[PDB]
Design a binder for these strands. Structure first.
Ligand SMILES: [Mg+2]
Ligand SMILES: [Mg+2]
Ligand SMILES: [Mg+2]
Ligand SMILES: [Mg+2]
Ligand SMILES: [Mg+2]
Ligand SMILES: [Mg+2]
Ligand SMILES: [Mg+2]
Ligand SMILES: [Mg+2]
Lengths: 78, 76, 85, 205
RNA sequence: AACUGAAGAGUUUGAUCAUGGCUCAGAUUGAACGCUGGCGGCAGGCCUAACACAUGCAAGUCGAGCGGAUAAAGGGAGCUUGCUCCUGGAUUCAGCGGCGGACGGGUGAGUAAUGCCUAGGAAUCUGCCUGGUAGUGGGGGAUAACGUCCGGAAACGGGCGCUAAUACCGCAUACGUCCUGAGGGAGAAAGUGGGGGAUCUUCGGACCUCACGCUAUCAGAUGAGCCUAGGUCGGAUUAGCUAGUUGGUGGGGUAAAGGCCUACCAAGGCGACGAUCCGUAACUGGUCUGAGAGGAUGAUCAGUCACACUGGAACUGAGACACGGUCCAGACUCCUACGGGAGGCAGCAGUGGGGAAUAUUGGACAAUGGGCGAAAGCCUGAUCCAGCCAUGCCGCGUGUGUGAAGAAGGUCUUCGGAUUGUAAAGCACUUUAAGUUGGGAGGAAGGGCAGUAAGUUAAUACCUUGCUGUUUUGACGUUACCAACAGAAUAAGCACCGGCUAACUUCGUGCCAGCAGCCGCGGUAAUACGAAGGGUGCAAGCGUUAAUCGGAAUUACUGGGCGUAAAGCGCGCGUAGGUGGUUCAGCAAGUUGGAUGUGAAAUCCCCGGGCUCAACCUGGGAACUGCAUCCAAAACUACUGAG
């Protein structure tokens, strides 16, 4: 299956996720089909937490992309 | 995609051989050399002569080392 | 080791022995047709061809031979019966 | 690593005032700045041509208190920016926080201003900064923390502002002790003894 | 958003100009060693023996697939405090099954080629996902468990007897599937669970509905297999190499084109544009130097390939010729009742060995992810976190002010003094980090339970979904961070000082010991050896060694030379190849301009944004010089036609 899930970038104790669409049998930090947004939990000041783009998420979700548990709510809270 | 060369061989059976010249440039000295190319175009009717000027195109492989075919004979 | 690889080990011969019976049966009903061609037999091969088409295709949807392999014998063996006319 | 030791002795080799001692008592009375230091303080002659460029670079590097690992770091940010690396090298040494505390006049020496930053007594945007490398911007309201507004180190130093004047890119308020860094300096308030065409040429070869 | 650099010196000579070597100043490393040693962030840590391995752990999960045996609560009775039996039954897991172990983690042995990059295309496949479409009718024979017997030192093996399934196999039907020449012919399936109006009935059940699962098939994404063209290290003191070899035909074989394979036919194929052979090496996006052109190099991170003690081989399956699978042969350890067996850390730790040299037998599933079940849950040595090591980059401390009797004390001296030096001492203040005490976020999204509203329906029963209410969850952790208390207390070395090259004099030593990157010093006055004062460079580091690129216009495309410094074949003729006088005309292969597809993300660069700053993290752009397909222009080169 293909799936929409979260990567992990940044230092220790300061994460920064990436909404990628990947084949399911890959690594976390490995290859991907494309990337559509990010998610910053520790965003402070001028930083933006959610930055999903609704165009490609309209495209992939109509072709059987299968989201994760956190991405079940982050697309919902837009 | 369509190439052009001249025939050098008629020895095999239903199989012709072309020379495709080419001017590549040298990567560091800025000069256009000539370096050749020699294919095995699939002849079809055993009717080309040594010294022609023909036209080839690419198909699926027919034997091994023979994937190009013959479009048409341009000039003698 | 595991107590789960030793289960997939026992579960391999129970299918290896089972698939071999379903696989060799196909080949006996095909060699009956080919040995009947070589003796220039028109009606002997025609009877063997009739009762071997259902054996091949019923062994195709079980998943023993692939469905494009069963599509290949039926085309070629018809091409040798029309060459006896 | 700072420099802890004698401080007339640095002013005594380069042969200038250099503004290192604190009070307005006297130059060349605490110091005796007539000679090169050491035993052979009388013999002189023919500073080498390489030795002139190193003497100019070491002069600018001892006014402010940097070390060379930091100083080459400022030199990279000079050559990154657009145009006139000599002026840009100075304006990254003017915007540093231990300089601006000295320019406002919250200390006698420049090394006193380093200690007032280091003990969390200085704020920048309303929040505490204790780093003597903080590059301030245009319009940062440097103020003094209320727990130490009664220190005589700050009160006495404002009478030492009389022999200095205002540098006309700051403004200081002698009641609430809240300076305002107005804008960047120009290449007119800096003294002509420093040379922006010897330090740049030293870091080529 | 677009964006700038280029240094020289010493050494051949009585001295000079030139040619030409050598050596130094720079920035860098998975670095090692010597001296010295406060702190915290963010990083990295077997480059050598792919050399053997003690002991722990690294892939299992489903009782809403089916047997079986454990049988609670409770319903109890009875008998006299406890047992008896009964009744239901919640739990629980050895077995059959469905899935998954082909993903994730590790290492660089092999391979000089279509392996890997870039551009293309045609002959195929694809479990789980999405969109559809047509179904989900009936029937039979076995089998483990469990019995029981027999054999084995074990590791286990054998026999007879019994039972079930979504296990397995016929039969029935079928497009919108396969083959066929139209004509015609061939092929499937599995049920469990929540409910329930009516009705048949032991609501054993049928029944209706819902969720789930299964069977054909078309399309979409995703992954995979093939073919062409080009590029891809040194050696010419390696020049010929090859009979499935190179084509054709007939037949097989594989998901799929092909000498892939075979039977005859034919005598071809490649090669100085370097075949063949030898020697070494995993490639790539990138890193390190450079003003640039280039030159070396492929640690960590990412993509691709290749292996899993050595050599083979297939099965199972959607997809392996399979790191914790099977069979065989070999080598090597271990067990044994001597008959036979067992095992594979190039998974995480760890031991031995090698070596100039490289870390703890940690903590957890809370986070992000995977596998199974979607019902919660369960597994996870990949992940997220701690421990060790100045192994690197970036930041902060080791106090601040005043103070000349210019004190002792030291070294030198023309004996007058000079210098160490406001430096100390003395006096007045300051308390970050470290220490101590109190306080204290953010990483948490959910799950349970209850309620309610929507749509499913025959039945707002169940269930799905909004929402409400209530309750529960963190390895890190004594969290970052904040406040208070103590007091200047808790905290500086290392090389060098004749010239290149910043910085100097006395004392020992006398061709001895010794020094050294090059010039070269030392024979009794040494600014070069050994010390002492003084001084200069750098700092929590400083030095040497090893190794690349610069400087080297010293392999010169950008950017050199050949009368005498090294360098014009003894002279001809000439094949491949390189270059082409002059007018028109055509053409568009080069060439210029433009458009589209591509050039993975990271890295570098530019403008911003977050951590008290910076390193670090991160948003938007440019760039990736390329290759391909189209459109136009026609000066010059090419090709063509005429002079
Ligand atoms: Mg250069
Ligand atoms: Mg290990
Ligand atoms: Mg919390
Ligand atoms: Mg102290
Ligand atoms: Mg000496
Ligand atoms: Mg060069
Ligand atoms: Mg000639
Ligand atoms: Mg990129």
């Amino acid at each position: 299956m293909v799936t929409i899930r979260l990567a992990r970038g940044g230092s220790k104790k300061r994460p920064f996720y990436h909404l990628t669409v990947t084949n399911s049998r890959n690594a976390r930090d490995g290859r991907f089909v494309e990337r559509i947004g990010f998610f910053n939990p520790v965003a402070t000041g001028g930083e933006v937490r959610l930055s999903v783009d609704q165009e490609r998420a309209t495209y992939w979700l109509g072709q059987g992309a299968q989201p994760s548990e956190r991405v079940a709510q982050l697309l919902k809270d837009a | 995609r369509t190439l052009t060369g001249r025939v050098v061989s008629d020895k095999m059976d239903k199989t012709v051989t072309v020379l495709i010249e080419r001017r590549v440039k040298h990567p560091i000295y800025g000069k256009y050399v000539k370096r050749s190319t020699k294919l095995h175009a699939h002849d079809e009717s055993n009717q080309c002569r040594i010294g022609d000027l023909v036209t080839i195109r690419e198909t699926r492989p027919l034997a091994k080392t023979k994937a190009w075919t013959l479009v048409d004979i341009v000039e003698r | 080791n595991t107590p789960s690889a030793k289960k997939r080990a026992k579960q391999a011969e129970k299918r290896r022995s089972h698939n071999a019976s379903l696989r060799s049966m196909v080949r006996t009903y095909i060699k009956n047709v080919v040995k009947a061609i070589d003796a220039k037999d028109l009606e002997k091969a025609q009877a063997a061809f009739t009762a071997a088409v259902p054996v091949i295709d019923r062994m195709a949807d079980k998943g023993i031979i692939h469905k494009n392999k069963a599509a290949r014998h039926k085309s070629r063996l018809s091409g040798h019966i029309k060459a006896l006319s | 690593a700072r420099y802890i030791g004698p401080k007339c002795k640095l002013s005594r080799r380069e042969g200038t005032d250099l503004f290192l001692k604190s009070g307005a008592r006297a130059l060349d009375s605490k110091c005796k700045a007539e000679n090169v230091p050491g035993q052979h303080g009388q013999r002189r002659g023919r500073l080498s041509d390489y030795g002139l460029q190193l003497r100019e670079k070491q002069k600018v590097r001892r006014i402010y208190g940097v070390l060379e690992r930091q100083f080459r770091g400022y030199y990279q940010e000079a050559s990154r920016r657009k145009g006139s690396t000599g002026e840009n090298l100075l304006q990254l040494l003017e915007c540093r926080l231990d300089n601006v505390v000295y320019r406002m006049g919250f200390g006698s020496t420049r090394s006193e201003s380093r200690q007032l930053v280091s003990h969390k007594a200085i704020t920048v945007n309303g929040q505490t900064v204790n780093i003597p490398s903080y590059q301030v911007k245009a319009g940062d309201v440097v103020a003094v923390r209320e727990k130490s507004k009664n220190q005589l180190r700050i009160a006495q130093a404002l009478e030492l502002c009389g022999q200095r004047g205002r540098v006309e890119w700051v403004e200081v308020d002698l009641d609430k002790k809240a300076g305002t860094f107005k804008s960047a300096p120009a290449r007119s308030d800096l003294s002509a003894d420093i040379n922006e065409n010897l330090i740049v040429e030293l870091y080529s070869k």
